[PDB]
Amino acid sequence: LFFLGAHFVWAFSLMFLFSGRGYWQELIESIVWAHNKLKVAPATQPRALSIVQGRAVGVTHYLLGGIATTWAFFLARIIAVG
Amino acid sequence: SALVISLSTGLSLFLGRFVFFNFQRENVAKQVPEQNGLTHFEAGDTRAKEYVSLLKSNDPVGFNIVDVLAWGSIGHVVAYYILATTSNGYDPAFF
Amino acid sequence: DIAGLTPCKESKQFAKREKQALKKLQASLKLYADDSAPALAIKATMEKTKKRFDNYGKYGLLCGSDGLPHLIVSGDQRHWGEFITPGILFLYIAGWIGWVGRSYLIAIRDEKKPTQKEIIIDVPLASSLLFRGFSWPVAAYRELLNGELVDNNF
Amino acid sequence: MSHSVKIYDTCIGCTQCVRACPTDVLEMIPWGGCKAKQIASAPRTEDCVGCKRCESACPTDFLSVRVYLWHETTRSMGLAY
Amino acid sequence: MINLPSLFVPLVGLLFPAVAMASLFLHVEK
Amino acid sequence: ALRIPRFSQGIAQDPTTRRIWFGIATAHDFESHDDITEGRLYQNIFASHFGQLAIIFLWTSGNLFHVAWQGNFEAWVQDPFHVRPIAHAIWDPHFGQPAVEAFTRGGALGPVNNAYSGVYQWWYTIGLRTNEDLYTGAIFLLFLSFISLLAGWLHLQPKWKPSVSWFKNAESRLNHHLSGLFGVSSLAWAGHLVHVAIPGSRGEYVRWNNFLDVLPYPQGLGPLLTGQWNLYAQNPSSSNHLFGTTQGAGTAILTILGGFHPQTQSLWLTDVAHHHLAIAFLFLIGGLMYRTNFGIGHSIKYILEAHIPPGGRLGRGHKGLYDTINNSIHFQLGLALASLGVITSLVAQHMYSLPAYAFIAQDFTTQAALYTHHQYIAGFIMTGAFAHGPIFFIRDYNPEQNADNVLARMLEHKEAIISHLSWASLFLGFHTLGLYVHNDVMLAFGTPEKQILIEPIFAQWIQSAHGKTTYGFDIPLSSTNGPALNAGRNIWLPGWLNAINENSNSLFLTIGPGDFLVHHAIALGLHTTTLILVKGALDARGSKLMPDKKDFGYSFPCDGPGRGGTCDISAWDDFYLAVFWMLNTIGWVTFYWHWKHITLWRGNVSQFNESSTYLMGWLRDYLWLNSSQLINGITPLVCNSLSVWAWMFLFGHLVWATGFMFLISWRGYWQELIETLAWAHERTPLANLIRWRDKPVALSIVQARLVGLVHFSVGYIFTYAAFLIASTSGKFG
Amino acid sequence: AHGYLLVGPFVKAGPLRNTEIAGQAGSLAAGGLVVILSLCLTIYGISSFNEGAP
Ligand code: CLA
Ligand code: CLA
Ligand code: CLA
Ligand code: CLA
Ligand SMILES: CC1=C(/C=C/C(C)=C\C=C/C(C)=C/C=C/C=C(C)/C=C/C=C(C)/C=C/C2=C(C)CCCC2(C)C)C(C)(C)CCC1
Ligand SMILES: CC1=C(C/C=C(\C)CCC[C@H](C)CCC[C@@H](C)CCCC(C)C)C(=O)c2ccccc2C1=O
Ligand code: SF4
Ligand code: SF4
Ligand code: SF4
């Protein structure tokens, strides 16, 4: 029941690892627009991730993803036969 | 049941509305002018549409449907025949 | 009734699910609490999923094959409150999340400079604003369409 | 184009504003006043590489600047060598 | 003669490539 | 420092490799590289894709010519039972003997892979029987596919106009096409099936010699021209057929009528032809809709014009969509792509459930590696469709020329457009993901009950309207009869479009809670995939973070750091980003069929039904069940029948993985150590003097977003390629 | 010198190795490599032409 999540979290990292940055900006405004119509956004200028933060949220996830995957894969083949 | 020749009667209702103008007035296709060679230039790119030319035939050639459609389809059509047929002709009714 | 086979009143396939499974989780012949005071499969965890019973409620409830329930939610027969009953509920609760979203917000921008009030939060949850949300009768549902947020504010 | 990334702005004043960039920019041309009145997007640019260190600081107030020449030297590359 | 149709894999998959990897080193020069 | 391969100068110079890599991968982008004039360009794409059609026939020729010295028909017609009919003979020197294991297939000596490609059922599928009758294949197609080159040149050469202006009409063309082409292209087909093929299907044979002597009939075409028409359809077939031999085969061309067949599925031979005929009026009646300088009919502006259903009193223009789409050539190549894209799947999702083919589906490997090469592609299009309609916006497109005017207005009121798109996804997001973890938290919690599944009406309901037949309903005002349809009945829908419920091969399979999710997760695909393509497109012209972002609109990938920090914010790098979800939809979708089908074939159905529901055990069985077989073709104790596939399947996992470099590497790190690694030679003996013609470099900053991809893709698409086949082949299904 | 190399490399490590044939021990394929090698070598002497007899 972990082995699916965290075998998910990993396959979420690539999004953070593989992508632009003024992209989620360019997107974050379409958002910010819809937001202003109802009067619900501006204050605390919502901003995309800090080029290298984006890399910080790669990696870190790619690891706690790709890793606990086996932490699961393991404890599941020594408990019970072996 | 199915009036099959209800509608093939029907479609050469309209394309005899095609037998049209090749015959009468002038040389044919009202020209070519535009087609080979090409347009002024034009260049929107471009014309010609008139909402007004539905007149001329709609009354004249209203008949054409009939001509096969009537007496010629379900006719025994071109019964009034004979006219050189040793190799053979007839053509004898499938009706 | 609508295709997945019918309710509790009979769903054999469903019955077989009741039984094996749990009843076997039972089928550890014992493992021993003959007095013993702790270990709780024994009592409920079964019985709390188990004194689920020819009763469940009753609930209708469709039970496809393998007798797991399917939810139609049509407006028919038995099934209406498998979406609407807990549907308007979802709506009502949300929207009184964001009616106050569009509130401990449209209350500042104002006075002497308000540039990040927002990260500390006087009063928390707005609260004051909060109850506005249950005390919406109608609320946005006409005021959003007229005046205040108004087409001009549009 | 062969180096064409617009950093222009309007003040083109360069005090506590921007200088950074390997050679490329001599500016201080003036144009017949703007307050500080040193203007233009550039000096002659066939010399150095492709930074956007070019803004990073002192306004461009439309586009940032960036890679784009395409038409690319070696000296303008860094590597030939 | 008996059993011998093996030339349209080197002429192609081997020698044709030789031609072009040579030849097309026209991209460098000619 | 030489001057070198030309069109560019910009390119023609840098020593650094970029000169080659790039050399190849402009070739195709004609507009606005050195050569180009609106007269050059056009023609320079015209005698290009006359170099097209051309290469499609050197493909087709050999498709028919690695058949008929070897690899059966004259055994596959004799009567063809799901064993292993052949394309071609493998010949590799690397092979072991263990080659003797198929890598050779009953009858033929050569080891071959045999055909998954659709044809064998279509070359046969109409007539074309006979193993002494055929080597024809290339002979024609090729004595065709060279003519395909001849105009190429002929129309190349100025004398006989290649013709510039000529390329902008429409009306004339498309007034020609959707009659001349399609219409008579049908018709003529309607022709062929009927004189030469249907006779082969019931058939006894046509013999090469006689066209006149062969008649369908005894008293001949018969009035027909005379309309009765009707009575073709009396006693056309007789269902218990012995197909291709009579005995009850019967001869009145054409039908609605009789059978789904236990012998054949598919589509009664006649009907694929009255249809091919039937439509061939409408397009011919359609063709002849616009001008050609005679003075009848219609001009393409002035129906768009001041035309317009809404407003008319609204305040939105129509004016010149026609010279902005005509003048664009990208608008062109992107309403082209899509239509094709939308219909490439309509092809491929109808081709199943409704295969046209003797002995297919229930051949049922080749039915499952042919739904997808038409799902891949088709998805693969769509993207490019959406991608040439964000090039129109930058290279072409004319804000003053367009304005107030409905295509504009699309830019103008755009911030909404991506939002009411992104609102669909985010909703379609967490809500599919609540339902599937919850569905997997429950289980293995060991309450399966207290699973949440919707048995999902909306489809089942469609398919009452049609039917049948599963257990009734009336459905108030149908009622399972009484109100029957009444206006309609015995004519039209007959026995046909009545498989009903029919596990084996129904058309319609009986949908439940497993299908109320994938079906919401294919829907979260083309939505997300398109919020990024819609967006990608909308501001290729660009936004706030870039106002400018133009005159290279498309691929300018990257920008300097600062501002907020700016990156894959070219409409190409959103296209670049798009292609991952077109590789994720076109995966959920294909994934879906197969598991379903698979299970359907020695089939429990049940199994998908409980095992569509939740995410784990989408691995466990499917994905985990049924790799089974392939993974040992290697298996240590020697090699079993499929080895190509599993080695491909790991070739699959490498090409993929090795994407990532390109993708988590970013030219900076690579270039710099090549700066140290090009101090080697320059410094180290017996390696020296010795000059590159091209300076060492590390790949440009757009290039590798591609290459990882165009790498991510093969791996991925070469793995399922090898996966499904390597598992729908043993089976069990 | 580079010549009689490339023997035990492809006559003792050959594809199905330790040969019983008259050929290898062998010229064989290796003689084929000096040909591929030697012209892969020439179309590099199209980097310099610079052409004379002195
Ligand atoms: C039916 C086709 C159709 C047509 C007529 C065109 C025509 C054009 N496209 Mg195009 N395109 C299409 C479909 C089409 N496209 C689709 C479906 C996509 C994505 C789904 C694209 C994505 C695309 C991009 C990004 C661009 C174009 C561009 C162009 C223009 C230049 C072509 C070029 O750069 O190729 C030259 C390419 C080569 C000579 C080869 C390099 C290509 C690589 C990536 C190989 C692809 C994968 C390959 C099969 C894997 C290797 C095989 C493996 C077995 C080893 C030209 C107008 C360019 C343009 O002008 O826009 C401004 C460019 O931006 N297209
Ligand atoms: C990128 C991909 C590409 C590739 C490689 C293929 C490959 C294939 N497709 Mg295909 N397809 C594609 C894109 C592709 N397709 C697209 C984009 C579409 C949507 C339009 C389709 C729609 C499609 C259909 C509907 C089918 C296929 C089928 C096939 C298979 C049959 C072999 C064949 O096509 O011979 C090609 C043959 C020719 C090019 C020659 C025939 C063309 C005739 C109609 C020409 C008529 C001209 C005539 C002479 C005019 C007469 C005038 C006068 C006599 C009156 C083959 C696997 C078939 C299949 O199911 O296999 C089982 C079939 O079902 N495809
Ligand atoms: C498996 C995947 C992973 C996940 C979860 C996502 C999720 C998403 N991608 Mg994405 N992506 C991925 C991999 C992933 N991607 C990869 C590998 C690529 C290519 C390299 C992309 C390329 C891509 C593009 C181009 C776009 C997206 C977009 C999106 C969003 C679309 C909206 C949606 O689907 O519903 C919403 C999200 C979900 C259903 C995921 C779960 C999110 C919630 C439920 C988090 C759970 C809360 C949790 C309990 C709290 C834990 C946090 C912490 C406190 C411990 C969504 C957030 C688009 C977007 O921005 O939409 C506006 C679009 O921009 N992706
Ligand atoms: C499976 C993977 C793929 C491959 C093949 C490589 C390979 C390499 N990476 Mg790498 N990398 C990858 C994915 C991959 N990476 C990914 C996904 C990431 C990040 C997500 C990285 C991040 C990374 C970094 C930071 C570095 C590397 C480096 C390297 C190089 C290490 C030196 C070496 O042993 O190479 C040679 C050996 C191989 C590539 C493996 C063997 C290949 C086999 C199949 C033989 C094929 C050869 C044969 C003659 C083919 C010709 C046949 C013909 C038909 C073409 C090597 C080129 C480093 C480097 O350059 O140091 C020297 C550097 O440190 N990588
Ligand atoms: C079912 C049904 C039916 C019908 C149907 C129809 C008729 C339809 C639909 C639907 C549709 C009809 C759809 C469509 C789609 C399309 C698409 C999806 C396209 C796309 C694309 C795009 C959108 C593009 C865009 C662009 C851009 C991006 C920019 C500019 C340029 C261009 C334009 C390129 C019938 C009859 C049987 C009846 C019953 C029901
Ligand atoms: C997806 C993606 C984004 C978009 C990701 C974003 C915007 C994540 C930030 C989302 C925050 C964490 C949401 C915070 C909102 C809540 C904390 C506020 C309400 C508080 C609660 C009680 C819910 C980038 O910004 C990016 C930047 C650089 C390289 C790659 C990427 C990248 O791949
Ligand atoms: S950076 Fe901009 S503002 Fe500063 S001097 Fe240059 S042009 Fe002026
Ligand atoms: S980085 Fe940009 S601004 Fe700076 S010198 Fe180079 S080109 Fe000029
Ligand atoms: S490579 Fe990095 S630093 Fe350079 S432009 Fe792109 S994102 Fe910015």
Residue F701 touches chain D, beta carbons under 8 Å: yes
Q: How far is the CA of C21 from the CAs of C18, C26, C32, F444, F608, in angstroms?
A: 7, 8, 20, 12, 21
Work out the end-to-end distance of chain B between its first and last CA atoms, rounded to an integer number of angstroms.
17
Q: Which two tokens stand for residue F116?
A: 């998954």
Q: How far apart are CA G50 and CA C64, in angstroms?
A: 86
Ramachandran bin of F409, using left for φ above 0, alpha for ψ from -120 to 50, beta for the remaining angles: left
Q: How far apart are CA B62 and CA B70, in angstroms?
A: 13
Which of D6, D17, D19, D21 to mutate to test ligand 8, by most ligand atoms within 8 A of the CB atom? D21
* HSE-up (13 A, CA, CB side) for residue F101: 11
Q: How far apart are CA C30 and CA A41, in angstroms?
A: 61
Q: What is the 8-class DSSP label of residue G24?
A: T
SS3 assignment, position F451 = coil
* Range F528-563 burial, b when 16+ CB lie within 10 A, else e: bbbbbbbbbbbbbbbbebbebbbeebbbbbbbbbbb
Structural domains of chain F, ranges and CATH numbers in brackets:
1-733 (1.20.1130.10)
Q: What is the 8-class DSSP label of residue G1?
A: -
In angstroms and rounded to an integer, the radius of gyration of the C-alpha atoms of chain D is 13
Q: How many CB atoms lie within 10 A of CB F84?
A: 19
Count of domains observed in chain B: 1
Report how many helices (DSSP H) and strands (DSSP E) chain E contains, helices first: 1, 0
Closest residue in C to F607 (Cα–Cα): C66
- Class assignment of domain D1-81? alpha beta
* Range F49-64 burial, b when 16+ CB lie within 10 A, else e: ebeeebeebbebbebb
CATH number assigned to the domain comprising residue B50? 1.10.286.40
Q: How far is residue G27 CA from its own chain's centroid? A: 9
CB F510 within 8 A of CB F468: no
Token pair 């004609």: residue: F30
Q: Which residues of F touch A31 (CB under 8 A)?
A: 419, 422
Of F223, F277, F296, residue with least CA distance to B15 = F296
Of F5, F9, F19, F11, residue with least CA distance to F692 = F19
F28 is in an annotated binding site: no
A7 is in an annotated binding site: yes
In angstroms and rounded to an integer, the radius of gyration of the C-alpha atoms of chain A is 19
Q: How far apart are CA B41 and CA F328, in angstroms?
A: 17
Atom of ligand 3 nearest to the CA of A18: 20
* Range C73-82 burial, b when 16+ CB lie within 10 A, else e: beeeebbeeb
Complete DSSP assignment for F153-210: HHTTSTTS---SGGGG--BTTBSSHHHHTHHHHHHHHHHHHHHTTHHHHTPPP--TT-
CB F419 within 8 A of CB A34: yes
Helix F147-154 vs helix F138-145: crossing angle, to nearest 10 = 0
In angstroms and rounded to an integer, the radius of gyration of the C-alpha atoms of chain E is 14
SS3 assignment, position D29 = strand
F229 to chain B nearest CA, in Å? 6
Among candidates F420, F444, F565 on the partner chain, residue whose Cβ is nearest the Cβ of A50? F565
Of A16, A13, A81, A15, residue with least CA distance to A51 = A16
Is the Cβ atom of F144 under 6 angstroms away from ligand 2? no
Q: How far apart are CA F698 and CA F286, in angstroms?
A: 56
Is the Cβ atom of F537 under 6 angstroms away from ligand 5? yes
D58 is in an annotated binding site: yes
Name the helix (H) or strand (E) containing F325: helix F321-326
Helix F422-442 vs helix F525-538: crossing angle, to nearest 10 = 150
Q: Which residues of D touch F15 (CB under 8 A)?
A: 74, 80
Quickly list H helices, F351-421.
Answer: 380-388, 399-402, 414-417
Closest residue in G to E29 (Cα–Cα): G46
Q: Which residues contact C45 (CB under 8 A, 6 or more apart)?
A: none
Q: How far apart are CA A40 and CA C102, in angstroms?
A: 6
C-alpha triplet A55, A60, A62: angle, nearest 5°: 95
CB F612 within 8 A of CB F519: no
Is the Cβ atom of D17 under 6 angstroms away from ligand 8? no
What residues make up the domain containing B88?
A: 1-95
Distance F30 CA to ligand 2 centre (A): 28
Question: By CB neighbour count within 10 A (0-12 exposed, 13-18 middle, 19+ buried), where does C27 fall?
Answer: exposed
Q: How far is the CA of F548 from the CAs of F397, F404, F408, F569, F699, in angstroms?
A: 15, 22, 18, 12, 26
Among candidates F451, F457, F471 on the partner chain, residue whose Cβ is nearest the Cβ of C68? F451
Q: How far apart are CA F434 and CA F448, in angstroms?
A: 16
**CB–CB of E6 and F91 under 8 A?**
yes
Greatest extent of chain A over all pairs of C-alpha atoms, in Å: 62
Token pair 């070219």: residue: F570
CB F486 within 8 A of CB C19: no
In angstroms and rounded to an integer, the radius of gyration of the C-alpha atoms of chain F is 30
Complete DSSP assignment for chain B: ---HHHHHHHHHHHTTTTT-SSSSSSSTTT---SSSS--S---SS-----S---TTTTTGGGSHHHHHIIIIISS--S-S--SS-SS--------
**CB–CB of C70 and F447 under 8 A?**
no
**CB–CB of F165 and B39 under 8 A?**
yes
Work out the end-to-end distance of chain F between its first and last CA atoms, rounded to an integer number of angstroms.
63
Helix F380-388 vs helix F340-350: crossing angle, to nearest 10 = 170
E15 to chain G nearest CA, in Å? 11
Q: What is the 8-class DSSP label of residue F392?
A: T
Residue closest by Cα to atom 4 of ligand 7? D58
Name the helix (H) or strand (E) containing G36: helix G28-40
Q: How many CB atoms lie within 10 A of CB F301?
A: 22
Of F590, F589, F593, residue with least CA distance to F733 = F593
Q: How far apart are CA F105 and CA F113, in angstroms?
A: 9
* Range A6-44 burial, b when 16+ CB lie within 10 A, else e: bbebbeebbebbbbbbbbbbbbbbbbbebbeeeebbeee
Report how many helices (DSSP H) and strands (DSSP E) chain G contains, helices first: 1, 0
Of E1, D25, B18, D48, residue with least CA distance to F288 = B18
In angstroms and rounded to an integer, the radius of gyration of the C-alpha atoms of chain C is 26
Q: How far is the CA of C58 from the CAs of C6, C52, C62, F105, F188, in angstroms?
A: 11, 10, 11, 61, 65
Complete DSSP assignment for F422-436: HHHHHHHHHHHHHHH
Q: Which residues contact F660 (CB under 8 A, 6 or more apart)?
A: F708
Residue closest by Cα to atom 21 of ligand 2? F344
Domain ranges of chain C: 1-154
Q: Do chains F and C touch (3 or more CB pairs under 8 A)?
A: yes
CB F385 within 8 A of CB F338: yes
Q: Which residues contact C105 (CB under 8 A, 6 or more apart)?
A: A39, A40, A43
Of F390, F402, F400, F399, residue with least CA distance to F318 = F402
Q: What is the 8-class DSSP label of residue F33?
A: S
Phi, psi dihedrals of residue F671, rounded to the nearest 5°: -55, -45
Name the helix (H) or strand (E) containing F533: helix F525-538
Q: How far apart are CA B33 and CA B39, in angstroms?
A: 9
**CB–CB of F560 and D73 under 8 A?**
no
Q: How far is the CA of C127 from the CAs of C101, C131, C133, G37, in angstroms?
A: 11, 7, 11, 82
Q: Which two tokens stand for residue G18?
A: 């330790």
3-state class percentages of chain F: helix first, strand second, coil last, to nearest 5 = 35, 0, 65
**CB–CB of D56 and F15 under 8 A?**
no
D51 is in an annotated binding site: yes
Q: How far is residue C52 CA from its own chain's centroid? A: 21
Q: How far apart are CA A14 and CA F659, in angstroms?
A: 12
Q: How far apart are CA F612 and CA F600, in angstroms?
A: 13
CB F514 within 8 A of CB F613: yes
Ramachandran bin of F25, using left for φ above 0, alpha for ψ from -120 to 50, beta for the remaining angles: left
CB F514 within 8 A of CB F616: no
Token pair 């020729």: residue: F61
Complete DSSP assignment for F35-57: T--HHHHHHHHHTTTTSTTHHHH
Phi, psi dihedrals of residue F84, rounded to the nearest 5°: 55, 45
Of F281, F279, F240, F232, residue with least CA distance to F259 = F240
CB D44 within 8 A of CB D25: no
Atom of ligand 5 nearest to the CA of F388: 34
Distance A28 CA to ligand 6 centre (A): 10
Of A34, A28, F417, F418, residue with least CA distance to C102 = A34
**CB–CB of F577 and A19 under 8 A?**
yes
CB C43 within 8 A of CB C9: no
Q: How far apart are CA F495 and CA F213, in angstroms?
A: 36
Q: How far apart are CA G40 and CA G19, in angstroms?
A: 29
SS3 assignment, position F317 = strand
- Exp. method: X-ray
Contact map slice: E 1-30 vs G, CB within 8 A = 18, 22, 25, 28-30
Q: How far apart are CA D61 and CA F201, in angstroms?
A: 74
Is the Cβ atom of D25 under 6 angstroms away from ligand 7? no
Q: How many CB atoms lie within 10 A of CB F276?
A: 19
Among candidates F546, F566, F695 on the partner chain, residue whose Cβ is nearest the Cβ of D80? F695
Q: Which two tokens stand for residue F88?
A: 């071609």
Q: How far apart are CA F645 and CA C24, in angstroms?
A: 44
Q: Which two tokens stand for residue G21?
A: 């044939």
Q: How far is residue F493 CA from its own chain's centroid? A: 30
SS3 assignment, position F397 = coil
F558 is in an annotated binding site: yes
SS3 assignment, position C110 = coil
Q: Does domain C1-154 have CATH number 1.10.8.110?
A: yes
Q: Which two tokens stand for residue F596?
A: 């379903």
Q: How far apart are CA F199 and CA F191, in angstroms?
A: 12
Helix F525-538 vs helix A22-37: crossing angle, to nearest 10 = 100
Q: How many CB atoms lie within 10 A of CB F697?
A: 24
Of C71, C2, C66, residue with least CA distance to F607 = C66
Of F402, F384, F380, residue with least CA distance to F393 = F402
Token pair 């299970």: residue: F599
* Range B18-31 burial, b when 16+ CB lie within 10 A, else e: eebbeeeeeeeeee
In the chain, the amino acid numbered D1 is M
Q: Which residues contact F60 (CB under 8 A, 6 or more apart)?
A: F141, F145
CB F530 within 8 A of CB F582: no
CA quadruple F147, F151, F154, F159: dihedral sign: positive
Distance F265 CA to ligand 2 centre (A): 21
In the chain, the amino acid numbered F285 is I
Of F499, F717, F724, residue with least CA distance to F595 = F724
**CB–CB of A22 and F616 under 8 A?**
no
Q: How far is the CA of C88 from the CAs of C137, D14, F425, F481, in angstroms?
A: 14, 61, 22, 37
In the chain, the amino acid numbered F588 is W
